[PDB]
């Protein structure tokens, strides 16, 4: 099982995604996160700072 961190998503039942660990400490059973912007996933829209993770590109600014 995996957790789609960040804000919302666009994934449904097909999307091929890359997985890394990291327990949510909150939802038992979950043991893994889903890398945003990885192989099928969209990097979050408008993530100004700490944008390295969430695969949010350097702003055009």
């Amino acid at each position: 099982t995996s957790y789609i961190g960040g804000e919302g998503h666009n994934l449904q039942e097909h999307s091929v995604i890359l997985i890394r660990g990291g327990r949510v400490k909150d939802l038992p059973g979950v043991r893994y996160h889903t890398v945003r912007g990885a192989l099928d996933c969209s990097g979050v829209k408008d993530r100004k700072q700490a944008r390295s993770k969430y695969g949010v590109k350097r702003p055009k600014a």
């Binding site: 449904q12 039942e13 097909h14 091929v16």
Partner: protein, 556 residues
């Protein structure tokens, strides 16, 4: 060589239909059985050939009497065309001057390079005749890389510095990738046409078309399917590059600070639309992959991830186009696909107007409990483009619904708003109102109010005996002039609603509104009804009244 073959018939059709101003620089010698060669209308001589086939050796002959009268006729009309866009050679014709054969050979060549008239020649490839004469014309009348003006283009910057793609062997390196096809035994064989410049096998080139920077692996040339490696990439030629990634179909490669002379060409329409289902979803991953590398090399082929039904949609150009594509999968790509059909976009809507439906939720049993009791007025809203698909208005005046609960109650309605209990589909055009309610102290939480209104939603929904709504997708077509009615009736039968039709340049444009569900593979039908001389586009227009019969049918 076949029964009913008339040369002259074509030289008329090419005008009556295409208007190419034919110049039959060729003319045969005989009918089905009697075809025995052609008459060369540049030297006024005729050619006879060897035994029936094999085109062993040419027999250099003259004009036989049976056609001499005719050949001279068309000739004077042929040389009448020897000068029609040029005053110098015009007086040659005006004075009837015996213009030099080899000269007038090039006079028309100018016109063909001017792209006005075309060589019209006759021969039987199956009988080996007429072909050789044609091949000679391929030289004596066809252009070369230097015979065409160096194409104008852009550079990379704003003004784009309109350039010319000189085929000179000193012009900076430039070439476009027109074909993309991965070979099984070798690799991703990419084809490209050398436009300008040269290089040995292997150079780092700036693909300014997409702003890329690549290399060159082996520079092999495809005879037909046999790998022929080359080193010098000579200007003006064609060959197949290998070992590249970023080079999508239709991309120009230029390394020496010589940006692209780019042009775009591929813009057809994936008219045919189907869905496909792989067996054993593990086969779905590879299908996602196979289609990925597949659907990228071929341009006009598209794939969608349906935002409504999450169906893998194939988008293709023609009936056969999809047929071969999937044929490729199972065969050479190892992919078993079951061809399905598109899903729908049905929407739930309430027909009538409710009046007082109330939703109560009380479960005490002791301890902590929940309580809720509201009333609503769900009304068929105008199916307007107001983003508020449902329109809701607070209507508690006495202060009997504490502020906290509003977001809660509306969520209860809005959560059930996209389930449309009648058929599981989403809901639209709803004039919902909140006119009265009643809250219990502490035992009432936000939770109970989400429920109560949802259930309240249901009875009024059930008291509204809801109706469906298919999506209506606008349609515009094009059929010359003779299929007018035949196309319309076809559309009429499809449960469409005609909405206007016009006459133009050479076609009849018709505007209609027909349910999308009936467009399953319409395109092929139209081409059949119009000798393939017709096509259309179709895009969303609105959701409209569902058909009663299908309403009870569409139900799973």
């Amino acid at each position: 060589d076949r029964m009913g073959a008339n040369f002259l018939k074509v030289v008329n059709q090419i005008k009556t239909r295409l208007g190419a101003n034919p110049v039959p620089l060729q003319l045969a010698i005989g009918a089905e059985e009697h075809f025995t060669g052609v008459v060369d209308l540049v030297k006024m001589k005729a050619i006879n050939w060897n035994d029936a086939d094999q085109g062993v050796t040419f027999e250099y002959e003259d004009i036989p009497a049976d056609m001499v009268e005719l050949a001279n006729e068309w000739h004077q009309n042929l040389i009448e065309s020897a000068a029609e866009a040029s005053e110098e050679l015009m007086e040659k014709y005006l004075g009837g001057e015996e213009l030099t054969e080899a000269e007038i050979k090039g006079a028309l060549r100018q016109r063909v390079l001017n792209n006005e008239i075309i060589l019209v020649t006759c021969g039987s490839a199956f009988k080996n005749k007429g072909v050789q004469a044609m091949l000679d014309a391929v030289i004596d009348y066809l252009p070369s890389p230097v015979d065409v003006p160096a194409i104008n283009g852009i550079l990379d910057d704003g003004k784009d510095t309109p350039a010319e793609r000189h085929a000179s062997d000193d012009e900076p390196f430039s070439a476009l990738a027109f074909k993309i096809a991965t070979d099984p035994f070798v690799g991703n064989l990419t084809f490209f046409r050398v436009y300008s410049g040269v290089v040995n096998s292997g150079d780092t080139v700036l693909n300014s078309v997409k702003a890329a920077r690549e290399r060159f692996g082996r520079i092999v040339q495809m005879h037909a399917n046999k790998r022929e490696e080359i080193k010098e990439v000579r200007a003006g030629d064609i060959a197949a590059a290998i070992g590249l990634k970023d080079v999508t179909t239709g991309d120009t490669l230029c390394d020496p600070d010589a940006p692209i002379i780019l042009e775009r060409m591929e813009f057809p329409e994936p008219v045919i639309s189907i869905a496909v289902e792989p067996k054993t979803k593990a086969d779905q991953e590879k299908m996602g992959l196979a289609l990925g590398r597949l659907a990228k090399e071929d341009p006009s082929f598209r794939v969608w991830t349906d935002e409504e039904s999450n169906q893998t949609i194939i988008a293709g150009m023609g009936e056969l186009h999809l047929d071969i594509i999937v044929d490729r999968m199972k065969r050479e790509f190892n992919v078993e696909a079951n061809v399905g059909k598109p899903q729908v976009a049905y929407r739930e809507t309430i027909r009538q107007k409710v009046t007082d439906v109330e939703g109560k939720h009380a479960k005490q049993s002791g301890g902590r409990g929940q309580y809720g009791h509201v009333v609503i007025d769900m009304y068929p809203l105008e199916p307007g483009s107001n983003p508020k698909g449902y329109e809701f208005i607070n209507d508690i005046k006495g202060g009997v619904i504490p502020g906290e609960y509003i977001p809660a109650v509306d969520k209860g309605i809005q959560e059930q708003l996209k389930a449309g209990p009648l058929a599981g589909y989403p809901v639209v055009d709803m004039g919902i109102r909140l006119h009265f309610g009643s809250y219990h102290d502490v035992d009432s939480s936000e939770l109970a109010f989400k429920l109560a209104a949802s259930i309240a939603f249901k009875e009024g929904f059930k008291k509204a005996k809801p109706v469906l709504l298919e999506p209506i997708m606008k349609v515009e077509v094009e059929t010359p002039e003779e299929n007018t009615g035949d196309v319309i009736g076809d559309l009429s039968r499809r449960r469409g609603m005609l909405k206007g039709q016009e006459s133009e340049v050479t076609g009849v444009k018709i505007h209609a509104e027909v349910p999308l569900s009936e467009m399953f593979g319409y395109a092929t039908q139209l081409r059949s009804l119009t000798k393939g001389r017709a096509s259309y586009t179709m895009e969303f227009l609105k959701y409209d009244e569902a058909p009663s019969n299908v309403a009870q049918a569409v139900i799973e």
